[PDB]
Structures are given as structure tokens and as C-alpha cells.
Design goal:
Order of helices and strands: EEEEEEEHEHEEEEEEHEEEEEEEEHEE
CATH topology of the largest domain: Cathepsin D, subunit A, domain 1
Helix content: under 10%
Oligomer: monomer
Number of strands: 24
Strand order of the largest sheet: 18-17-12-13-22-14-21
Shape: globular
Strand content: 35-45%
Distance between the termini: 25 Å
Bound molecules: N-(2,2,2-trifluoroethyl)-1,2-oxazole-3-carboxamide
Number of domains: 2
């Protein structure tokens, strides 16, 4: 089997992407944030504290003839950005782009943190990291991909995120019309439960390529590109007036600037992030200080190839017995 679904930016900055997902019988369609950096499929629901729901579409398990309470199961997750959610668990039928999994753990939120409430466009998350990170207790549950894998034509999914435009998540096949040149594959460590890999280096603008190993995660659920302080300083040094602002929470730059591109290495191949992709706009409405899309990972403990990097590529998440990651230009 295969599936194919369009993913759409939630706003004009590409802060995140939402993909429609059918849950239950009859189908209830929710717009979920597909997140290769976590492993829980959780939704706003009829059980979510009412004051914490503000415009989201909710899943109502009592209206699904295929929903079953997973007795005794609870979940609770905290994300790298400080947000969180928790609740109980149903199993139900879940379909993405024509691909159906029966008995998928659908984690129903009883509580969500303010950042989730405040984002009316995201109805929940669909985790696509390794199932070892799933938070359901006392019986850990499998991701949608993990459940679908054996049925797929090929044990893969691909992310093709757009810049200020829709893109595609495919399951079970590689669309050879969606990229240019060849796909370069690179090794993955699953030891921390992430799609963790090692970039071979970087360049800033038209500058020379620096060969250096940068370990990090391919994370569709993180907006920005978080890299070591040395690398990030070298980038922003090429933008007149750019500076790190402790009050704002990262590098900012004059909105009048033209940003240089940023290149990252995948083996001997190179992915070029255009300068425009690194502009996240005014820090507050009307400001002439703009927020940068490349930021230091120093406070985080891990480097993160988030949407800024991934949307410059066609990315293959290869879930074969030994997982790997593939990147192509597009
Ligand atoms: O925050 C999470 N993932 C995104 C991160 F890697 F950037 F942190 C998370 C929470 C539970 O499992 N993973």
C-alpha cells in the first residue's frame, strides 16, 4: 500500500505545516502537525479541558464506531520548546492520504499547554520518530508509520515541505518526479529515538565549504535550523547589523538586509538553503528588526535540522531494518 497527503503551512512564515488525517468511523478529519522529532499521535478532543480549546477541531471518540478505550493507558509529553500535553488513549482507524491503519493509538488530550490552545490551526501532532520515544504508559504504543510499515510497498516515508507553499508527505514510495539529481543517503543512529545523522559540513553564501561533522536530527516539527554557536556566528557575521539578542531570544537582523544562502553537506552532496528561507520576519508587528531562521543549539543539547533546512530538500525517511536518511535537491 501507499499514501500521499498534502501538507500546508499554517501561516505566512511557514511556522509549521498541517496535514489532514482521517480518524474514526465515520471519518473525523483533523489537521495534524507531522513531527519526525516525536512519537505520539495526539489530538484535541471532546475530553480536552474546555478553556484550553480555542478554534481547534476535536476528535470525539464516542461518535466513532471503531473507537475503543485503551484501558488504563495515559500519556504525557513535554516538547523542546516548553510546550506540553497529556491525557488518555483510544485505539481507532487512522488514514493519511489513502493509507489506513487499524488499531492506531490515538492519544486524546485532557490538558494542553497555552501554546497549543493559542494555535487554532493545529488540531494535534502525528509523531514520526522511533516508537521508543512514545510516552504511553504502562504499555508503549507504536507510531502510525511503525504500524503501517509492513503493509507499505517500501518501508519509507518522504517529506517534501514547501517554501511559502504546500508540499507533500508520501508513505511507501519515492516519487522520482519530486526531486532533481540523485538522492544521497546517510547513516542514522536511533539510539536517542530520533532520525539522527551527521552532516559533513557547511558553507555561508558563496563562501568555501567547511568540512566538519555536525550531528543532528531531521525534525519536521521544529521550525528553525539550530546549529553549533560557531557555525551560527559565521553565518550571521555575513549580515550587516545582525546580532544575538538575549531579550528577543536569538539572532536578529535588519529587515532591510539581503540574507546569504546556507549550504549543508550530506555526504559528498550539498543542499542549499536560499537566503529568503532564513527570514522569519519582524520580531513584533511593525518592527524593522527581523528574526533569523538559523539559531544556536547551545542551550538545547542537540542540533536540529528543522523546517528551514528540510524544506530546501526532498527527504527520505528510510525505515528499513537499518534506517537511513536520504536528501535530494528539488
Ligand atoms: O521535544 C521532543 N522532540 C523534539 C526535539 F527533539 F527537538 F526536542 C520530544 C518530546 C518527547 O519526545 N521528543
Amino acid at each position: 500500500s501507499t499514501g500521499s497527503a498534502t501538507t500546508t503551512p499554517i501561516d505566512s512564515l511557514d511556522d509549521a505545516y498541517i496535514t489532514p488525517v482521517q480518524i474514526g468511523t465515520p471519518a473525523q478529519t483533523l489537521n495534524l502537525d507531522f513531527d519526525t522529532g516525536s512519537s505520539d499521535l495526539w489530538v484535541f478532543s471532546s475530553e480536552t479541558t474546555a478553556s484550553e480549546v480555542d478554534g481547534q477541531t476535536i476528535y470525539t471518540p464516542s461518535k466513532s464506531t471503531t473507537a475503543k478505550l485503551l484501558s488504563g493507558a495515559t500519556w504525557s509529553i513535554s516538547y523542546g520548546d516548553g510546550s506540553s500535553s497529556s491525557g488518555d488513549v483510544y485505539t481507532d482507524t487512522v488514514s493519511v492520504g489513502g493509507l489506513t491503519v487499524t488499531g492506531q493509538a490515538v492519544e486524546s488530550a485532557k490538558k494542553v499547554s497555552s501554546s497549543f490552545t493559542e494555535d487554532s490551526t493545529i488540531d494535534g501532532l502525528l509523531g514520526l520518530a522511533f516508537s521508543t520515544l512514545n510516552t504511553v504508559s504502562p504499555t508503549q504504543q507504536k507510531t502510525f508509520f511503525d504500524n503501517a510499515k509492513a503493509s507499505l510497498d517500501s518501508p519509507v516515508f518522504t517529506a517534501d515541505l514547501g517554501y511559502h507553499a504546500p508540499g507533500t508527505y508520501n508513505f511507501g514510495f519515492i516519487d522520482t518526479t519530486a526531486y532533481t539529481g540523485s538522492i544521497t543517503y546517510t547513516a542514522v543512529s536511533t539510539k536517542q529515538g530520533f532520525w539522527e545523522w551527521t552532516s559533513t559540513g557547511y558553507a555561508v553564501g558563496s563562501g568555501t565549504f567547511k568540512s566538519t561533522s555536525i550531528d543532528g536530527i531531521a525534525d519536521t516539527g521544529t521550525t528553525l535550523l539550530y546549529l553549533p554557536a560557531t557555525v551560527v556566528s559565521a553565518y550571521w557575521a555575513q549580515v550587516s547589523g545582525a546580532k544575538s539578542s538575549s531579550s528577543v531570544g536569538g539572532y536578529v537582523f535588519p529587515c532591510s538586509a539581503t540574507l546569504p544562502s546556507f549550504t549543508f553537506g550530506v555526504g559528498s552532496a550539498r543542499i542549499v538553503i536560499p537566503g529568503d528561507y532564513i527570514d522569519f520576519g519582524p520580531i513584533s508587528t511593525g518592527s524593522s528588526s527581523c528574526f533569523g531562521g538559523i539559531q544556536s543549539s547551545a542551550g538545547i543539547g542537540i542540533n536540529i535540522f528543522g523546517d528551514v533546512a528540510l524544506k530546501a530538500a526532498f527527504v527520505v525517511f528510510n525505515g528499513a531494518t537499518t534506517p537511513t536518511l536520504g536528501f535530494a535537491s528539488k
